[PDB]
């Protein structure tokens, strides 16, 4: 015959979508918080900062 | 529930043409051949042809050509009998059968119109 | 849902791929296995066979199979199909190509149904294995424990997620079709298909639909009968022979698609602490290999992590700016030890 | 083929010897397991029982099975014939005492027929291991490879190259055929049956087809009668008594010989190959324990060989006069390595 014709591709699998490891690159950014202040006779009072 | 539902009972004249049909209800698959076959009155069945309502791939008897021709239409899901001169011999019972689709057989025919009846004589 | 299943049966149809070991030998199985997808936690796999499932000869019925005995789509009732991986799997569900199940770990995975006179096994050499959800290493979803976040193979008839090729199939091979009409080769169409002939010289590469007799070859062996057929599609597997249908890249939703679930994780027994000041012994009675690990919450976290699988007695050195353990699928612990009162400074 | 199982019925016949955990205790079952024989590679094992399967009681009729239930040989249609040693088997093909099956690793052989209201089962305590072929150890047979040449339990039918013997049935002990006619016991003869006695004191030690009765005493208990037949043979099995009378050394071929055969033997992925001039760097990601050997093309060979089974580097230094490394079944692969071009000499 001289033929036969395998054909092999790569592709995401159906379980791509669910567990996937992400490469993230990484920078300083910023930094925050959220504190809870109180003074005098207010009562406690939070808020992010 | 499925069904085959044809025209009415014809009256006609040997000479002139005539157009008969068989339409498909409660089945939403196009993947079915849809069969004609004739009862003489008295007498037993003689299948006429069958067409395939996907592609309108023909199936024919083969004592029937030009005399008799099968087409399809898909918006209706119906196949179309269309005889160009009648003959005397033409009076009869033709019957439309549904024979779904199983290998590269025709297979058996699962329900049934309840029968056209056209008598032509002069 | 049904309406996917009728999708379903627009154009595909069970086909005789190539299955190794049917039974005891490789053969062309109406059952085969391609593509078995066993990467659930807690044990399901999914199995892409050649025969259809639920689909029978004329509507859905889903105690219906349906697979092809030759030239012939037969349907028959789901009588008894079974899935071994190394003890009987207990299959979940079943849809067109695909069936659903829930296997035990081992080196094999092999269908089979009964047709009644016959079994009809295909056998394939997939090393499947179970992957316990947590840090405890549990062969078996346990009875209790604590729920957490696994991907399983969602037991939903249908979701449109994902997707898989329909193609033409391929002209099929044959010679029962060719017989000897008196001492010459014929060709006898099954009425319904265009069967195309190859023989001894150069023929009419295209077939007839009308039954044909060649003069060029007397006897069947220089002579055979590609079948084919244009009115139902197969799915474009990699043990069908390609045709000439190089069109129609149809779809297919995949019935069974990996979407998150909770899988209960077992609760190891706890541990035995014993704060003696300055450090921290933890005696460690597990029933499955379970992790331990441990970080200090200062400048230097001196990580430690290990897998325990017997009764065992580990200390830790707890200084005064603190110690966290966890242990199995309980959450972390901390433990901020120091004021011993050893000696006397007076 | 037809004259093999001619040639083992013109003698032969099923008994009952032994066979523990026949169920769940000891008994003597009709199918009494013996000379258990996994030797082949791809797991196939030939078994041997003292059932009679493949022949009827008047002819062959090959999907039959003739065994002993008590003191005649019934023939019964083969309903299910179920080996397992860990999971079920797939038997393949069975003769005259033999059965040849497929079955998986494990540590026991249990073999049984249905009868149709009883079972007949028997198992015994048999180490079986599948025995990879080649360099690579798979559990199971795959579908795609490298033919090796292994050795295997050949499934002809018919063969001549070995024999076991068959000898004259030893004495058949039996209590069921001593009734009392009045007040004495009365030995039975089953119309064909010589049948020996032996009472309280010494009685007649021969014999008579004649049914007896003897007034040594009133108990059946204190006299046994020997079931005796000179008309079908038995294989000398260790777990029945030997006949006083040592004549009939009797030839019966062995079905099933071992043969050389060609095993399909895995392929292991192909390996990274890091050529860093003055060395080699060599990335290896096996999916079974495959080995790796190398060794050097010079005057000392130098060799190494490790059994690989999980992703590892490997690196080999290759002089320049070359260095071989084949790495599980693949061909072997030649490197030679100088002239590297680090630093310059002006």
């Known amino acids: 015959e001289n033929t036969q014709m395998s054909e092999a591709y790569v592709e995401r699998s159906e379980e791509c979508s669910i567990d996937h490891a992400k490469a993230y690159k990484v920078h300083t950014g910023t930094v925050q918080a959220m504190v809870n202040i109180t003074y005098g006779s207010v009562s406690w009072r939070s808020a992010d900062v | 529930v499925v069904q085959l539902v044809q025209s009415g009972a014809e009256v006609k004249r040997p000479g002139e043409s005539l157009r008969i049909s068989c339409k498909t209800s409660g089945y939403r698959f196009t993947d079915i051949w849809i069969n004609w076959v004739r009862q003489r009155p008295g007498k037993g069945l003689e299948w006429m042809g069958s067409?395939?309502?996907?592609?309108?791939?023909?199936r024919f008897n083969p004592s029937f050509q030009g005399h008799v021709t099968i087409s399809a239409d898909k918006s209706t899901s119906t196949t179309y009998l269309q005889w160009s001169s009648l003959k005397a011999s033409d009076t009869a019972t033709y019957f439309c059968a549904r024979s779904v689709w199983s290998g590269y057989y025709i297979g058996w025919f699962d329900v049934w119109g309840p029968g056209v009846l056209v008598t032509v004589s002069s | 849902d049904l309406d996917t299943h009728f999708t379903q049966y627009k154009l595909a149809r069970p086909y005789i791929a190539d299955c190794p070991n049917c039974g005891h030998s490789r053969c062309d199985s109406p059952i085969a296995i391609e593509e078995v997808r066993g990467d659930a936690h807690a044990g399901v796999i999914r199995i892409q066979t050649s025969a259809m499932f639920g689909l029978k000869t004329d509507g859905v019925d889903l105690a219906y199979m349906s697979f092809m005995n030759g030239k012939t789509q037969k349907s028959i009732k789901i009588d008894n199909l079974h899935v071994r991986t190394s003890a009987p799997c207990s299959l979940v569900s079943h849809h067109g190509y695909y069936i659903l199940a829930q296997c035990p770990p081992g080196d094999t995975v092999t269908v089979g149904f009964h047709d009644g006179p016959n079994r009809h096994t295909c056998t394939v050499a997939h090393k499947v294995e179970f992957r316990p959800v947590g840090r405890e290493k549990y062969r078996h979803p346990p009875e209790h424990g604590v729920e957490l976040p696994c991907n399983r193979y969602t037991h939903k008839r249908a979701d449109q997620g994902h997707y898989v090729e329909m193609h033409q199939p391929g002209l099929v091979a044959d010679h029962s079709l060719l017989s000897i009409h008196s001492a010459k080769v014929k060709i006898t169409v099954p009425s319904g298909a265009q069967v195309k002939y190859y023989c001894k010289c150069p023929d009419v590469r295209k077939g007839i639909t009308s039954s044909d007799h060649t003069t060029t070859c007397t006897d069947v062996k220089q002579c055979r009968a590609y079948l084919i057929d244009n009115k139902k599609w197969v799915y474009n597997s990699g043990r069908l022979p390609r045709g000439e249908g190089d069109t129609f890249k149809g779809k297919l939703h995949v019935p069974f698609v990996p979407v998150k679930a909770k899988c209960i994780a077992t609760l190891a027994p706890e541990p035995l602490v014993e704060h003696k000041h300055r450090t921290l012994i933890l005696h460690l009675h597990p029933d499955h290999p379970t992790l331990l690990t441990t970080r200090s919450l200062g400048s230097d976290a001196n990580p430690t992590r290990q897998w325990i699988e017997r009764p065992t007695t580990v200390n830790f050195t707890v200084t005064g700016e603190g110690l966290e353990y966890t242990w199995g699928n309980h959450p972390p612990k901390r433990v901020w030890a120091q004021e011993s009162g050893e000696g006397n400074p007076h | 083929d037809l004259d093999t199982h001619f040639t083992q019925y013109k003698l032969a016949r099923p008994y009952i010897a032994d066979c523990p955990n026949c169920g769940h205790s000891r008994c003597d079952s009709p199918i009494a397991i013996e000379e258990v024989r996994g030797d082949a590679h791809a797991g196939v094992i030939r078994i041997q029982t003292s059932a009679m399967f493949g022949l009827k009681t008047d002819g062959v009729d090959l999907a039959y099975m003739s065994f002993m239930n008590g003191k005649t040989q019934k023939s019964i249609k083969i309903d299910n014939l179920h080996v397992r040693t860990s999971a079920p088997c797939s038997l393949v093909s069975h003769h005259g005492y033999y059965i040849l099956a497929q079955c998986p690793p494990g540590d026991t052989v249990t073999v049984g027929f249905h009868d149709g209201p009883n079972r007949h089962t028997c198992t015994v305590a048999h180490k079986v291991e599948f025995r990879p072929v080649g360099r690579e150890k798979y559990r199971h047979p795959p579908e795609h490879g490298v033919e090796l040449p292994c050795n295997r339990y050949t499934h002809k039918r018919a063969d001549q190259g070995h024999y076991v013997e068959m000898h004259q049935p030893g004495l058949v002990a039996d209590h069921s055929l001593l009734s009392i006619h009045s007040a004495k016991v009365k030995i039975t003869v089953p119309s064909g049956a010589q049948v020996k006695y032996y009472c309280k004191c010494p009685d007649v030690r021969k014999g008579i087809t004649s049914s007896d009765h003897t007034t040594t005493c009133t108990d059946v208990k204190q006299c046994r009668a020997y079931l005796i037949d000179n008309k079908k043979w038995v294989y000398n099995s260790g777990r029945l008594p030997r006949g006083e009378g040592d004549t009939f050394k009797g030839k019966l071929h062995v079905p099933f010989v071992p043969v050389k055969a060609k095993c399909i033997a895995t392929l292991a992925p192909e390996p990274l190959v890091e050529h860093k001039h003055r060395t080699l760097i060599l990335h290896l990601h096996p999916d079974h324990p495959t080995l790796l050997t190398t060794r050097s093309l010079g005057s000392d060979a130098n060799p190494t060989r490790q059994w690989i089974e999980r992703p590892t580097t490997v690196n080999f230094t290759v002089t320049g006069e070359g260095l071989e490394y084949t790495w599980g079944n693949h061909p072997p692969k030649r490197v030679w390595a100088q002239e590297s071009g680090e630093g310059n000499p002006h």
């Open positions: 067409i395939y309502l996907d592609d309108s791939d023909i």
